[PDB]
Amino acid sequence: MNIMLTLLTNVTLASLLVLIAFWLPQLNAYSEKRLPFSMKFFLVAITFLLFDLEIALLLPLPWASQTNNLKTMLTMALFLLILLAASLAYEWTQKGLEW
Amino acid sequence: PGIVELPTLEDLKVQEVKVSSSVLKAAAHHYGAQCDKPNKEFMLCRWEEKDPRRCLEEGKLVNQCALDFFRQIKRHCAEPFTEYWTCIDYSGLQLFRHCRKQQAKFDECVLDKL
Amino acid sequence: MTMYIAFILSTIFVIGFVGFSSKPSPIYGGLGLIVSGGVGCGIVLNFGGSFLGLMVFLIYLGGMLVVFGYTTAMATGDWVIYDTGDSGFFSEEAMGIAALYSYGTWLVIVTGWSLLIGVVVIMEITRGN
Amino acid sequence: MFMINILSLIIPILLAVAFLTLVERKVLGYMQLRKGPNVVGPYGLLQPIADALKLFTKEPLRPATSSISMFIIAPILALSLALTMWVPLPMPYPLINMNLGVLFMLAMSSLAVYSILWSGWASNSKYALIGALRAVAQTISYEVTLAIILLSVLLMNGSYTLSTLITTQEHIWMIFTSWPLAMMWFISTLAETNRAPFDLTAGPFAMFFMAEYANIIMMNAFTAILFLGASHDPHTPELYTINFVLKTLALTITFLWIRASYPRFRYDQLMHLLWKSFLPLTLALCMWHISLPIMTASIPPQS
Amino acid sequence: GYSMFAVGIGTLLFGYWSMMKWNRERRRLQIEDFEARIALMPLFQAEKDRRVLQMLRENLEEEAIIMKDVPDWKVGESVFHTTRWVTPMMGELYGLRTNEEILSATYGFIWYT
Amino acid sequence: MPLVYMNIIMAFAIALAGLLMYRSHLMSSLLCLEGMMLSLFIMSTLIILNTHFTLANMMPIILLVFAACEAALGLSLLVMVSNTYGTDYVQNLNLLQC
Amino acid sequence: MNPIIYTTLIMTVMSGTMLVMISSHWLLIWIGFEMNLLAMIPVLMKNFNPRATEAATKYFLTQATASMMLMMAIIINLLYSGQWTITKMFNPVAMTMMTMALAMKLGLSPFHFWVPEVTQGISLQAGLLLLTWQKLAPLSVLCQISQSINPNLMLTMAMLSILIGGWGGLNQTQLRKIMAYSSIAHMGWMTAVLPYNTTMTILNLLIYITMTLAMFMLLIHSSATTTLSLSHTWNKMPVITSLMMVTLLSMGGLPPLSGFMPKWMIIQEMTKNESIIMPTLMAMTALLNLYFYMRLAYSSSLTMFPSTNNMKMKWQFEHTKQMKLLPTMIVLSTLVLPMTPALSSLN
Amino acid sequence: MWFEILPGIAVMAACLFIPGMATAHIHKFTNGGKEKRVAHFSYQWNLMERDRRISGVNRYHVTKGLENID
Amino acid sequence: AGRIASFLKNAWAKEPVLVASFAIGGLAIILPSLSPYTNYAIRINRATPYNYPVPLRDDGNMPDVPSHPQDPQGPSLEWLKNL
Amino acid sequence: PFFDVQKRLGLDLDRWMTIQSAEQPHKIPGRCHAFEKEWIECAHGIGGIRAEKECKIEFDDFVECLLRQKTMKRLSAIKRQRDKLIKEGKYTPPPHHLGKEDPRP
Ligand SMILES: CCCCCCCCCCCCCCCCC[C@@H](O)O[C@H](CO[C@H](O)CCCCCCCCCCCCCCC)COP(=O)(O)OCC[N+](C)(C)C
Ligand SMILES: CCCCCCCCCCCCCCCCC[C@@H](O)O[C@H](CO[C@H](O)CCCCCCCCCCCCCCC)COP(=O)(O)OCC[N+](C)(C)C
């Protein structure tokens, strides 16, 4: 209720200000007179996406540290980070991060 | 399939503990130290019976014992307790650390008195 | 009742799915899917799934609808089923999600292997030649 | 009185942006052995008002063939996100108290690229689209390391609650526990807002400008709360408010200083900077900050 | 060269030690809060059971009043074969009550920020 | 099964039908799979939260991740097809026939 | 590609299939399917050409739609019973969703349209992999939940698959499309006995895999993908054409060849359940598969087609690379009928 | 000199003072002169609901002390 | 030895970021297995009561189980306090 | 088909996640945990056919707890009859159901 109302107020103020900005100078009359598709940008977007997926898994790490199984949790967190590093290394050594 | 039996409204009438959560948090440690036996009876009955309708008299007992605890507090050191709870009530997270001095005064009063 | 806010959210969800399912001007379909994702995030958050709703809204929207838009630009009854008790001094959703490392070792292993293989597969497919 | 609180949060932020324009001009001028605007107003104080009035009166050049819907929506989304991301922040008491406030801020930041994408696509120009694609790629690339650094730092806070950061830093600042992560975070926040040396790119133009400067102030305040924990006394929050505001102002002036001090990168050079210097160190320090509380038996409380 | 790295490592170690002490203190404070909650729990459980039973009995009485004209209705009839007590559903307690407190019990914790 | 579940199910059905239409623009096909997975995530999250099944709180995120990985591959495929024709039209993929 | 990457992708495909086969949780089965699909695409695109890219994108679209349908079935089954274990479904709607997802993954009619095109687009080794290894996981899942399936729907799709394979193979000159239609017909034969006996399903699967491996390795050895290209093999390798003719006779179900073992057994099993009409129609329709196998045999080994002059140079060279298991595959696909009772091993 | 920059900064500082302070003051006006109670984890919410019920005026912040025990 | 020293000296020049990252990651992997405070962290996590401690029904054969928290028998937290 | 590697090796790769009543973290209890436990204990080792025909009572209760369809039907019937009576005017809600009661802690 509070968050929805705050969002509505923010959007309403932004809309009001943009429309008044777009219509204040409209009252007075004036004169009123390709293909390339480079492959590297798609690859950086996909790398960001793959990395983003890895980011979600860790997200729970702050809570994962209270389990009484600290050894297993530490091992799996380090495994996830090592595999993220391995993805970065593989894309590095295969000329995936070049321009 | 069957009729669910419920206690009457008279069975659920009890002399209630009408103090706020700040007062309860201020008293909680000594309350757990003093009123432990009825509380454990109630909770053991509650996890064994798995039924609220089978635990009502123990709940009445814990209410009575809490009332007795607060009557003792009221009789011997009302002022020390009031100052301590004022501090607990002020904080939004109701942290014990924020008002250590008030707690210390309260602890000394109860030991001498009770 | 607030005239079944969950029901109207689900109705907006269905309306948005109808909107982008006609597939007009894939940028417009993408924007319809973004609106549908926001509404579904609102549904999950209003249900009580704060972390999962924020995961939708962050990962889903900010990463992968973003990548879809990037690639496209490069080219040419409620309130009743709910509970009665409380959770304690913690949120059950966070603990269950949090439990994957302690409990879900197998899931972590298979998911990490799949993601590494996915990186390799993407690079190999886009290699060209 | 929640609406009054919302207005008292929103209006001062826009006023602060308006006068941050003047502050930046005057700071750059005095760093360049000259004066800034000192004519419009007693000390240049009327300059932002004159700029706003001139911009709001000048003709808006709509491309006359561009997508009207997105051409209007992009500044709306920019302003909405810039004003929304102030809600989560605690100064000391937050307007809205969120359990996962940090995650909410991250999600808003992730959304912020849609305005860039839509404004670039609407312009109906190949060159503008190329520039927008550059900007989007840089923004997503750096938000990766922003997220990783953020979780590595929060592994010492105990949760995603922004208020708990005040409790974490009651004795010492988080800058001393992890300065390298703070350095990389500062550079990534520079890159995220497209500020120099990473600045490779009527009404709606002013709207975008306001959104960008609001994000600048917001990011600096977030850094101040995250790494320079001000002491908070529950019976006098004005001390915390003043201290936090001073630290935010110092960080904003540091952005201005960095703008006035350095040349700018190439696109491939900043891509390489990130993907080959920050991400490896970020992953290594993420492992280190996962291991450290367990090694030293210093795990934060909340679960 | 060596001095700058040494300064960095030294301040890192100082921060690590300080936060070790502070986080252990925070753990002890959290354990104290949990102990207070544990001490207070039985009274809250008793009150919760008694409140739920009262609401169920009130709903049963109102059902007895209302259903007097329905032919095949049985007042207070379970839908489960088992005689075991089942935790009541949220619609069972606030079904006949006013909208404001229904929305309260449903979304008060979710919407409270 | 209340009305919210049926709304999410019919959303999934609408997305599946839209995918099976294929007017043009294989990007739209990917978008339809994407809406399908989003509906799956929403309904699985609702079911798991309602029943208080604590452990399966993992599986929505996992689902997302895996589906998202799939999306990446699809995009790659789309891109490569465009590299052959200059457009992602569905009707260009008629070299192989029954 | 790099041999290391190729081996990694092959083991990832096998690990996905294995994950599907050994798990008891529906989420893990779905994950195994996802892993298999993810690692399968580069194998189909190992040799780069537009046709292979088209085949891979069609295969991905089909398999991703099937995976989404399968996850929908899983979630509905969870909704009507909070169970994650792969067992009887407990929901009529969920079972249908699951059956259609697995039929789409297998290529059963009316979801058969992708198989001929994908097989034609990809190379011969990719086709061997696609038609042999990619049927294990869906069929294993079907075997696990066979007590749930509606016999009407499964039998309808089985008969449709047999009819479609028989009719579609009659019109083909390309060898890969012939193999695809043959695989569709054999899948139809396999899925018609799931409601009654999963052991017969597994026996048919094993026999079909053996024959398909032999036929694909023979087609790779004599590097032909058309009828006329295969018609030249007698002028260089007549023994290969003879072995191919015997294998084709076996694939048509003639006794005393190995290919007679499944259908016979399946027919026998279906008779124990008072099902008479359906096996009769299945055999009559399999006569079509036999017809186009016989046409291939006529064009390859039973008659001598004209050759070219450059073939003389090919007379001076021998194969550098050999399949070790090709003789064993041929023998197991032609001469194992006397060992039929060994099917009690629950293969 | 350089202090010519100070005026505008001061103004900006004031604009950054308004939100924080305002919230604090409002959090005292709407919560009876105390900090606004924070409710994570649903146990603090239960405590707030109990206080709201036992207040007798339908406001949780009104605290019933030891004088209410009779 | 000598070749390893040459390689490390050559990498420490012109690639210091990678050397630092690999060293920090290796330390993060190795050090936890040797620290004596990891078991202390596990014990601290075990001592955090999130749930109500359900009492056990006394049957006359439970000497190690306390009847009251103040009783000497039962787990103590003096090691935690001294930390 | 199903190769039960976990049973042969005693691994427990994914069985921890299959049912509601299997050792949730922090001993959190599932809403339908009691019903599922009874259904499982009824049907253990008996086999699928006999479990489906003989443990139908427990599964029906478990299903009811999971979806609460019959409870919805009963509540809707009560609300609809109450609405009919209040529209006719021969029934009046008590002060408890109008928010005029005396709340209890
Ligand atoms: C034995 C057969 C070996 C050859 C076959 C290998 C097959 C492929 C390899 C992957 C399978 C590895 C098996 C691991 C299964 C996990 C379950 C088991 O190991 O126990 C876990 C032990 O986890 C340990 O951390 C094992 C660590 C192993 C994972 C790290 C590296 C794995 C890499 C394997 C392949 C990944 C990709 C390739 C990398 C090169 C659970 O620990 P615990 O907490 O007590 O119990 C939880 C239940 N509680 C909550 C009630 C207490
Ligand atoms: C056409 C010829 C095909 C030949 C097949 C390939 C031959 C090479 C195989 C190499 C040796 C295979 C033996 C495997 C070693 C251990 C076996 C163990 O792991 O599996 C057991 C069982 O192993 C196999 O069942 C036995 C395979 C034997 C296949 C031969 C029968 C084929 C029909 C007769 C045709 C003539 C073939 C003989 C000439 C070579 C237990 O299985 P179980 O976990 O409990 O349940 C899974 C099966 N269910 C689901 C159906 C119940």
Ligand SMILES: CCCCCCCC/C=C\CCCCCCCC(=O)OC[C@H](COP(=O)(O)OCCN)OC(=O)CCCCCCC/C=C\CCCCCCCC
């Ligand atoms: C809030 C705090 C803010 C702190 C930062 C304030 C900024 C001060 C003003 C300067 C910033 C100006 C911004 C301009 C951008 C500068 C970015 C930059 O150039 O960094 C690049 C730079 C190197 O790149 P190149 O020189 O181009 O060559 C690499 C290819 N061979 O990248 C880096 O080095 C990033 C490193 C960040 C700091 C990390 C250093 C830590 C190393 C040792 C730490 C050890 C701790 C481990 C635990 C100890 C256990 C024993």
Ligand SMILES: CCCCCCCC/C=C\CCCCCCCC(=O)O[C@H](COC(=O)CCCCCCC/C=C/CCCCCCCC)COP(=O)(O)OCCN
């Ligand atoms: C066991 C710990 C593992 C986890 C820690 C790692 C986490 C994150 C770090 C890894 C990220 C991925 C790394 C990918 C490696 C690719 C490097 C590379 O290819 O760069 C080479 C050059 O870099 C190299 O030389 C390869 C690595 C060099 C060695 C780096 C450190 C290795 C280990 C040193 C310390 C080991 C442990 C401590 C020893 C010191 C004493 C304590 C070429 O550079 P370009 O930019 O492409 O072009 C420049 C030429 N024009």
